[PDB]
Amino acid sequence: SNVVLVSGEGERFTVDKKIAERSLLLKNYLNDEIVMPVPNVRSSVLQKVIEWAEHHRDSNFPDEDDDDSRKSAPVDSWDREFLKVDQEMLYEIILAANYLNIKPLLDAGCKVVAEMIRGRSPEEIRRTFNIVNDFTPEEEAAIRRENEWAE
Amino acid sequence: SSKEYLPDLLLFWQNYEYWITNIGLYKTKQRDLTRTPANLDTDTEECMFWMNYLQKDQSFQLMNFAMENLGALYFGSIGDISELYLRVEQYWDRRADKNHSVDGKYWDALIWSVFTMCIYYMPVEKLAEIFSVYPLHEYLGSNKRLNWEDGMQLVMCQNFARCSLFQLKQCDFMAHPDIRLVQAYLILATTTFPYDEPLLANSLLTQCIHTFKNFHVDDFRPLLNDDPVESIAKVTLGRIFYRLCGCDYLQSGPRKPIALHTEVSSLNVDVYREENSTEVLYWKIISLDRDLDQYLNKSSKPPLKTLDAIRRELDIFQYKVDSLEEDFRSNNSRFQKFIALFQISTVSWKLFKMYLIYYDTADSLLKVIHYSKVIISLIVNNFHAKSEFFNRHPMVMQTITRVVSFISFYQIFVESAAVKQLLVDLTELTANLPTIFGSKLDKLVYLTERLSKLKLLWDKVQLLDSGDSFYHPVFKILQNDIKIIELKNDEMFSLIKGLGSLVPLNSDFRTIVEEFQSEYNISDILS
Amino acid sequence: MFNITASSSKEYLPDLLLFWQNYEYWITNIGLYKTKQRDLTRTPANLDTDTEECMFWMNYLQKDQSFQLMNFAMENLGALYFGSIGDISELYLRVEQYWDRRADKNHSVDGKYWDALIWSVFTMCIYYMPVEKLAEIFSVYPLHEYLGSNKRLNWEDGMQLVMCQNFARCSLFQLKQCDFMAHPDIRLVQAYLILATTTFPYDEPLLANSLLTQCIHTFKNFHVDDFRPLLNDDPVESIAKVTLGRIFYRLCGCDYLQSGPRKPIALHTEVSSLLNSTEVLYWKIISLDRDLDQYLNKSSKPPLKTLDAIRRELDIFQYKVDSLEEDFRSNNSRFQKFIALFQISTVSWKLFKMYLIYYDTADSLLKVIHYSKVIISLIVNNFHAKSEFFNRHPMVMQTITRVVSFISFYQIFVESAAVKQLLVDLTELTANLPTIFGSKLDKLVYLTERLSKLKLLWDKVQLLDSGDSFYHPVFKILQNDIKIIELKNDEMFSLIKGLGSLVPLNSDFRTIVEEFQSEYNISDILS
């Protein structure tokens, strides 16, 4: 029939059952109206997750235990035109897919972060050198002295 | 600017859980030997009454209740019960004889263990329609108005278990090992017999391991050159073996050294993944629990690859238990569904508890709260009609002990708003569990009450920092509970009292600690 | 036993001695002693026949006779109880107490443990007392008045064995009154290590294996991983750990001496290997005997360097045994030196037998004949010193069984005059072993007679060949003598009987084989 995904703020999102069994956690929760709390997810992020499941009802995803079909799968055109959002709300979508155990949203929604870590400019790797500490200042001086000769 | 002691206090919970809620509460029987009686005139006139109290039609009503409502428990051990009606017939035929063969007395002990399981899993409304209250009170000499739901069904369950043991001891079962001993113990292990006598159950389990490994059967796959009777014999032996490993892991501890379970379900080993998943699914979900509860007493973190592997097998067994047959016209299918779903909820809770303690991953506290609500939603759902007795299986006592002890431990140190409502819900659930658990339910309520009073002591005394490590009376009380129960689970003192004439010889916070240990002692949970 | 016309080649002898290394195990180790072919539809068992039996056998032994038994044990058995119970002068107080609170109505569990320990000690006293001292203490007439046998017999013609077995059964019955599975304590281990110095583990092998599994369970219950006196502990606990060391040595000794297929749970696996100060000597010799006799059932023949290292260690322990000083008036030290010298001679004989079989080293049959004459000169010497009870210890049944079976098997195939004189000496010694062995001695005489008739069958029937394989009726009869006992020690049929309604549905060469198996059946050594 229909289930209710109660968000972390308090709203109620009526989702179709076959669509909302994309989430492994809810599909295991249904084995007892069936409401269920999703505590750490805002209403907009859960709306984005439900729109993802509404599109990818009919699609077919890899077997969650792959080396080739899971790492080397390209993102969909909708999934790349779907995650052009704020970066913090992107990580909150990934947190929502890691709570609800939605593995293909944690697949296609997290290869985008992989495409953003690589493919970045080598100037702002030199700029982001010790934004987290990770080195003593003696070793920072030695590292900056080793490649002082080029620039 | 937060609470920094908390990781090395949850790492202490991983030791406190084992030395209180696992070993100290269920598997500790502090017995003196200069006070315990020993006779064969007390029990030989008591078990004679408990074997004369049952009649023929009452026993067949118990067997009908087993055939209709308990097929998830005996069918691994004894097979289908339609072969066992003949054994109840032969027991009531051979009742008046005076020369009993051992091959008759083993079937008598097996069907009295089946009767013990039937008494333990029967609702009080169906029990009052079968038996009678008043001859039992005219014999035992107690409070007369002490009806079955007020703590009397446990007494008849324990005495039927003791009569099944007395009929085993008439077999000279040490001198004649046979598979009916293993079957009778695997029927008795579905009751609270492994917790009313935690030192007798370990020795009977050692005798069942000796009885099983007497056969020297390691491969339960029927070979090509086997007798077609011997093939079905080895199939039934394999079902008995995995039921025996399931009821063998649950009694692990310091008072049970000889273990049968030697295999691994993830990642030498001997005997696994050769057997068809029919009711080894109950074993596979417990080895997946053994891979989590082997890090309680151990002092090293489980690797995260192991926890991810356990999470993947949890999802696989979720989809496997949802792949089971929907035989709603037999009431035992819902009970098998409840067992194989409550086990996977228990292992899920323990998995995300160990994620919360050892690594603090993504929303693991919310996953602990979620699977605690799933355990509550599985137990509260059984409070309807026709399935009220599902909450009597000992795994719900074990699991509710672990869950309410962890939530009461976590309410002390972390001021949260969902954990508080969850703790109120589990307190309401623990005060609504079935009363056939007996003294263990009252000791669980006492342990939850002690942790709540320890929470009230946490807010009272201000925390004393020292830079490198902290100091508080609550910390020292929790340190001392493990030391007291390790002192109680050390049989060296009974050894010094046993070898002969040997005699055993060996501020602001201490006052509060000794007053709290005098008012709320931890030795109350042993008995 | 081999790896058409007649031949005279000798390819049969090297594969035939390797076949002896399997026949010795499955006949003289497992089939003769550790196989008790039971039947459960025919065996009676209850608690009305044996309770008044134990009442009679405890009311028979008067008070002052028990102190003479204990004085005999103190003066003449010092090399047996010291491994188990230490000093028996500490145990006179327990005998005084048992003759005080015998008249009471309620016995404690500790009291009945001390009673079971001292009744096992009384069993050891009866088993090792000569008939001259035993006729002075006990009377014969009430035992005939109760049991109802022919009143003409003395103690020596099959009556001391009956009183020994009934005292062992009374010790076990007083263990059964303790509910010793529900109260594990070290007196169980001490009582069984006293009872295993008699022929209790051969008259009831499956019961003794279950008692030994309970003793391993009760010993590992205390969790002692090191038996060394540490300076930090209480000096009472250090004496307790010394006591557990000297009990663990005797317990792994009795663990080895019952290493059959009807005893699957081992203690000796948790010990290292060699590849007071006199009890550890017996431990080293028995461990070396284990390292020799583990190559019986397996197929991998041992290396030469392994047997040579065993030979160097054997010479070291031969020097250690030959240096034990002894007083001729102190009979305990004489029996001590007899046990040490007989065990080291048995290990020497087995080592040179493995030299003769596995490699056929030049000048090695002479060493086998030499150590067989050493064993004969040890056993015959005890008839000429009025210490006739030295030949009642169960190692002189095991050793003489192995020796007379190997010398008969070698006189069948390879004739020699020294081997024939040695076989005549073995037969004369086997006819003069003490009557307290009872049935096992007569079955050893039967086995020697059967291997003597097999020599006549080897002589009157000519050997065949097939180029590489050799055929003979003696070879097929010796194949089937292993196959019959491997069928008897197959516990699959008891499993099929235990799982319910499953009933099991199963030239002159063959003529001579079937006539010899009908005349001298191998299943006459079973019980």
Side-chain angles (χ1 to χ4, degrees), chain C residues 268-516:
Chain C
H268 67 278
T269 61
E270 286 81 1
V271 196
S272 296
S273 66
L274 279 76
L275 295 175
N276 54 3
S277 178
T278 184
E279 183 65 30
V280 68
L281 181 62
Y282 297 161
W283 163 247
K284 294 291 184 182
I285 295 168
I286 290 170
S287 67
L288 190 62
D289 198 0
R290 182 182 67 200
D291 292 331
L292 287 177
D293 286 333
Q294 66 182 357
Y295 292 104
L296 292 171
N297 53 3
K298 65 176 72 173
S299 66
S300 66
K301 57 187 291 294
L304 287 169
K305 290 183 181 292
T306 303
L307 296 178
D308 287 330
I310 291 169
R311 186 177 179 180
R312 273 96 174 96
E313 293 180 354
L314 181 70
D315 198 1
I316 295 300
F317 289 113
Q318 183 68 42
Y319 182 74
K320 289 184 183 292
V321 170
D322 290 330
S323 296
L324 293 175
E325 59 91 18
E326 52 89 17
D327 193 1
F328 292 99
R329 292 181 290 113
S330 178
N331 212 168
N332 290 316
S333 184
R334 289 180 62 189
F335 181 58
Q336 176 181 358
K337 186 176 174 65
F338 173 71
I339 290 173
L341 190 59
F342 190 80
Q343 284 295 111
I344 199 69
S345 297
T346 304
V347 175
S348 299
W349 182 77
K350 290 181 182 178
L351 179 62
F352 286 101
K353 180 177 73 69
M354 290 176 71
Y355 276 111
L356 179 64
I357 289 170
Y358 289 102
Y359 291 96
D360 193 73
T361 305
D363 290 330
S364 296
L365 180 63
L366 183 63
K367 299 300 290 293
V368 174
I369 296 167
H370 182 272
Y371 285 109
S372 297
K373 289 182 182 292
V374 169
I375 291 168
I376 294 168
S377 179
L378 284 175
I379 294 171
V380 174
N381 197 4
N382 295 318
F383 297 103
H384 293 171
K386 292 181 181 179
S387 67
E388 295 176 353
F389 65 95
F390 289 177
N391 294 321
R392 295 184 182 179
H393 193 276
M395 66 185 179
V396 307
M397 191 64 203
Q398 295 285 319
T399 301
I400 288 302
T401 300
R402 304 294 183 90
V403 169
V404 75
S405 294
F406 178 70
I407 295 301
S408 296
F409 185 81
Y410 191 75
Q411 186 56 251
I412 288 171
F413 297 102
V414 178
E415 292 181 353
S416 177
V419 179
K420 186 176 180 180
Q421 185 66 42
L422 186 62
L423 184 63
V424 172
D425 287 331
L426 261 301
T427 303
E428 184 179 0
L429 192 146
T430 304
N432 287 318
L433 288 176
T435 63
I436 201 65
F437 296 106
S439 66
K440 299 294 184 290
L441 181 62
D442 292 330
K443 294 178 187 296
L444 181 60
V445 173
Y446 177 77
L447 182 63
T448 303
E449 185 177 1
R450 186 177 185 271
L451 290 176
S452 70
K453 299 293 182 182
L454 192 64
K455 179 176 172 64
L456 277 71
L457 188 61
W458 177 261
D459 286 331
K460 70 182 288 185
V461 175
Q462 188 177 3
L463 179 61
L464 297 176
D465 61 350
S466 178
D468 186 74
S469 296
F470 289 164
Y471 291 162
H472 198 276
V474 170
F475 291 163
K476 183 67 177 177
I477 291 164
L478 292 175
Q479 295 296 115
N480 290 319
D481 292 332
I482 289 175
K483 295 295 182 181
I484 290 297
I485 286 178
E486 289 183 355
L487 185 63
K488 295 291 180 69
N489 283 314
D490 193 1
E491 285 288 327
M492 187 64 73
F493 293 100
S494 67
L495 188 147
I496 296 168
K497 292 184 178 69
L499 288 181
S501 296
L502 296 174
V503 54
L505 277 75
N506 289 319
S507 67
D508 291 330
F509 180 77
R510 185 177 176 87
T511 301
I512 285 171
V513 168
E514 289 178 353
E515 287 291 327
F516 184 75

Side-chain angles (χ1 to χ4, degrees), chain B residues 31-40 42-44 77-78 83 86-87 98-107 166 169-180 183 197 199-204 206-207 209-210 213-217 227 229-230 232-234 236-237 240 253-258 490-492 494-506, chain C residues 38-47 50-51 90 93-94 105-114 173 176-187 190 204 206-211 213-214 216-218 220-224 234 236-237 239-241 243-244 247 260-265 489-506:
Chain B
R31 295 291 94 189
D32 288 331
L33 295 174
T34 62
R35 293 182 179 91
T36 305
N39 193 0
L40 290 182
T42 299
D43 58 352
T44 58
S77 178
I78 67 171
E83 193 178 1
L86 181 61
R87 296 294 183 267
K98 296 180 177 66
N99 293 114
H100 294 90
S101 65
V102 185
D103 189 73
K105 297 296 289 184
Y106 272 111
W107 288 106
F166 183 73
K169 290 178 183 178
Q170 283 185 350
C171 297
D172 289 330
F173 71 102
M174 300 177 72
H176 301 92
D178 197 0
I179 199 67
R180 289 166 290 177
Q183 289 181 353
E197 293 290 330
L199 268 63
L200 175 58
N202 290 320
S203 295
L204 286 168
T206 304
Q207 288 294 320
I209 291 170
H210 173 75
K213 289 183 179 178
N214 196 3
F215 299 113
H216 293 286
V217 177
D227 196 358
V229 177
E230 186 176 0
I232 301 170
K234 287 194 287 185
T236 303
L237 188 67
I240 291 171
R255 301 283 79 78
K256 189 259 182 182
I258 298 171
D490 194 0
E491 289 289 328
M492 189 63 70
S494 68
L495 186 144
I496 295 169
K497 294 179 182 179
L499 289 175
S501 296
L502 296 174
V503 176
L505 294 174
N506 291 318
Chain C
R38 68 189 185 275
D39 195 359
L40 295 173
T41 62
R42 296 290 301 274
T43 302
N46 54 2
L47 288 177
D50 54 356
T51 61
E90 191 177 0
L93 184 63
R94 298 293 183 268
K105 293 183 184 292
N106 296 114
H107 293 87
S108 65
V109 177
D110 185 73
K112 296 300 291 185
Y113 267 157
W114 289 112
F173 190 77
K176 289 177 185 177
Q177 289 186 354
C178 297
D179 287 329
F180 69 100
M181 298 175 72
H183 300 92
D185 198 358
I186 201 67
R187 271 79 54 84
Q190 291 179 354
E204 291 290 328
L206 276 69
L207 181 61
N209 289 322
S210 294
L211 263 297
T213 301
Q214 293 302 114
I216 292 169
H217 173 75
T218 306
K220 291 182 180 179
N221 194 5
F222 302 114
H223 295 286
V224 177
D234 194 2
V236 178
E237 188 177 1
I239 294 171
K241 290 186 286 186
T243 303
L244 264 69
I247 287 172
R262 302 282 78 78
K263 188 261 178 187
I265 295 171
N489 283 314
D490 193 1
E491 285 288 327
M492 187 64 73
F493 293 100
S494 67
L495 188 147
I496 296 168
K497 292 184 178 69
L499 288 181
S501 296
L502 296 174
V503 54
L505 277 75
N506 289 319

